[PDB]
Amino acid sequence: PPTLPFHGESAYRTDYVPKPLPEVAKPVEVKLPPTLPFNAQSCYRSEY
Amino acid sequence: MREIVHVQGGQCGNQIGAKFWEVISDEHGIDPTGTYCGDSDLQLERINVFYNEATGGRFVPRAILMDLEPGTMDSVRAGPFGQLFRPDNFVFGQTGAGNNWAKGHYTEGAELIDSVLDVVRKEAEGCDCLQGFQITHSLGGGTGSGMGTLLISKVREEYPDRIMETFSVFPSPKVSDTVVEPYNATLSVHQLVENADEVQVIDNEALYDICFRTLKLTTPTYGDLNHLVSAAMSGVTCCLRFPGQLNSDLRKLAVNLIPFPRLHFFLIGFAPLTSRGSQQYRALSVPELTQQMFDAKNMMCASDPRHGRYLTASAMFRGRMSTKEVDEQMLNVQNKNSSYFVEWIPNNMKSSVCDIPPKGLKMSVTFVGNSTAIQEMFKRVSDQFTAMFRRKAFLHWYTGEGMDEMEFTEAESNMNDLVSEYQQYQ
Ligand SMILES: Nc1nc2c(ncn2[C@@H]2O[C@H](COP(=O)(O)OP(=O)(O)O)[C@@H](O)[C@H]2O)c(=O)[nH]1
């Protein structure tokens, strides 16, 4: 009688293979708006 | 860790366990010279459940060979997978019980039981401590029901909380070999009902009907019949040796199947079982594994389960398979065979999946189930007992060896009320 080869493997070692890690390098870049003027004067300095 | 001490007694026990250790060695990659082949990690991480290191790399079984005549012990050693056993685990008799429960239990089974309590305690205390004992023997012959029955007795008070698996073959209704059939049955069922945690029922014609109507094998040998039982009794303990998604041991099988501690008699099935010419024509998935599962021809118990009621059933599934295919198939066979299952236990059915299948098969499943349809064996052995007890037939062989007949009526009492308790649950 022959010895049949053992084929046997569990759910852990079939499903939980070491997975490829996600490729994450993405920051949230924000652009600062340029500054707005102080063209502002007071009545004393514009009339007197 | 967990360790199962296999005990086998009598000619039929030794022959049926030669096929048992044949399939366990094959499943675990064990050369009959003890060494290992098969280069798989899943083979050997749970090998102490049935084997032991023997400082030579080889694995000797934890098997206690027992017979009271040296006939078949020479044949089991001379056969294939026969040199795997330790010679000291054999115990040799010289007279042999001549199909006599009396002298096999009282007058000459007493001197050999001291030399075999040396070896069952040697295997028990050699490890850290064990899980259970499985005993394979006959209840129709003399050396099985006389000698192994008493071994079952004193291993209770030395290890009370340990599980006791036991596979027993029974006297047959139609053919009657070993002409004193019911005396060796009734006297040992008394012992077995109060000194066994769980017992599994095998019949010779039930094996012959499997070999004829399902396997279509014209010439059945005793090794062929032993292969069927041995394949069944490896499936009941798959999860002890292999992992799975849902694991279960002998204690899981016990606590779910016995609700009342005195009735522990089970029916055994095994699937798949194809013809050699019908293997390639038949599909292999859980809906047809479970529909061959509940068939009267499929059992190795010669009682029609439609005549009774399924008190509790369980299935040791094996192989990679969908968990909810198993779930849907148990629930379907309950609510469709509604009259076949008892009402007062909701969802009578238990399941366990052992991820690694047996060799050459993608999937398999093994039945262990308490049924009240075993009652028609208990009264069939009973009225065959009292038909020839009333006439004082063959009593002089028993009462002369040390027996008195006060345990003959009170075995009839302690078996007719097994019939009584199994009656009202259908
Ligand atoms: N299952 C099984 N039954 C057997 C085998 N050999 C014999 N028998 C049955 O056992 C009965 C005789 O049993 P016996 O040899 O007296 O059992 P003993 O007490 O162990 O000696 C016969 O009716 C056979 O049908 C076998 O290899 N397997």
Question: Which residue of chain A is at minimal alpha-carbon distance from B23?
Answer: A3
Q: How far apart are the first and last CA of chain A?
A: 119
- Whether B166 lines ligand 1, by a CB cut-off of 6 Å, is no
What span, in angstroms and rounded, lies between the C-alpha atoms of B254 and B262?
12
Instruction: Report how far ligand 1's centroid is from the alpha carbon of B181 (Å).
Output: 11
Deposited experimental method: cryo-EM
- Whether B96 lines ligand 1, by a CB cut-off of 6 Å, is no
Instruction: Report how far ligand 1's centroid is from the alpha carbon of B107 (Å).
Output: 23
* Contact assessment for residue A8 and residue B42, using Cβ atoms and an 8 Å cutoff: yes
Q: Parallel, antiparallel, or unpaired: how do β-strands B265-271 and B349-354 relate?
A: unpaired
Of all helices (H) and strands (E), which one includes residue B289? Answer: helix B286-293
A24–chain B Cβ distance below 8 A for any pair: no
Distance of CA B43 to the CA centre of its chain: 24
Distance of CA A19 to the CA centre of its chain: 19
Q: Is B177 annotated as a binding-site member?
A: yes
Q: Write the DSSP assignment of B371-398 as a string of letters.
A: EGGGHHHHHHHHHHHHHHHTTTTT-HHH
B272: cis peptide before it, omega within 30°?
yes
What span, in angstroms and rounded, lies between the C-alpha atoms of B357 and B27?
10
At B9, give phi and psi (nearest 5°): -130, 150
Query: How far from B258 is each of B32, B40, B229, CA to CA, in Å?
Result: 38, 37, 22
Nearest in space to B180 (alpha carbons), one of B3, B408, B21: B408
Asked if the Cβ–Cβ distance from A6 to B245 is below 8 Å, we say no
DSSP state of A35: P
Question: Residue type for B76, please?
Answer: V
Phi-psi region of B120 (alpha: psi -120 to 50; beta: other; left: phi over 0): alpha
Resolution of the experimental model, in Å, one decimal:
3.3
What span, in angstroms and rounded, lies between the C-alpha atoms of B425 and B59?
46
Q: Which of B28, B36, B40 to mutate to test the interface with A (most CBs of A within 10 A)?
A: B40
Look at ligand 1, atom 9, and give the residue with the nearest C-alpha: B12
Q: How many A/B residue pairs have CB atoms within 8 Å?
A: 39
What span, in angstroms and rounded, lies between the C-alpha atoms of B397 and B279?
50
B359–chain A Cβ distance below 8 A for any pair: yes
Closest atom, ligand 1, to C-alpha of B104: 19
What span, in angstroms and rounded, lies between the C-alpha atoms of B5 and B367?
22
Count of all residues that appear for chain B in the document: 426
Count of Cβ atoms closer than 10 Å to residue B86 Cβ: 17
What span, in angstroms and rounded, lies between the C-alpha atoms of B392 and B395?
6
Count of Cβ atoms closer than 10 Å to residue B99 Cβ: 22
- B348-384: buried (b, 16+ CB within 10 Å) or exposed (e) per residue? bbbbbbbbbbbeeeebbbbbbbbbbbbbbbbbbbbeb
- Let me know the angle formed at the C-alpha of B332 by B328 and B338, rounded to the nearest 5 degrees: 150
Residues with Cβ within 8 Å of residue B217, at least 6 apart in sequence: B211, B224, B276
Q: Is B277 annotated as a binding-site member?
A: no
Radius of gyration of chain A (CA): 36
* Contact assessment for residue B266 and residue B400, using Cβ atoms and an 8 Å cutoff: no
Residue B360: list chain A partners with CB under 8 A. 4
Beta bridge partners of B134: B6, B165
What span, in angstroms and rounded, lies between the C-alpha atoms of B6 and B161?
17
Instruction: Report how far ligand 1's centroid is from the alpha carbon of B205 (Å).
Output: 12
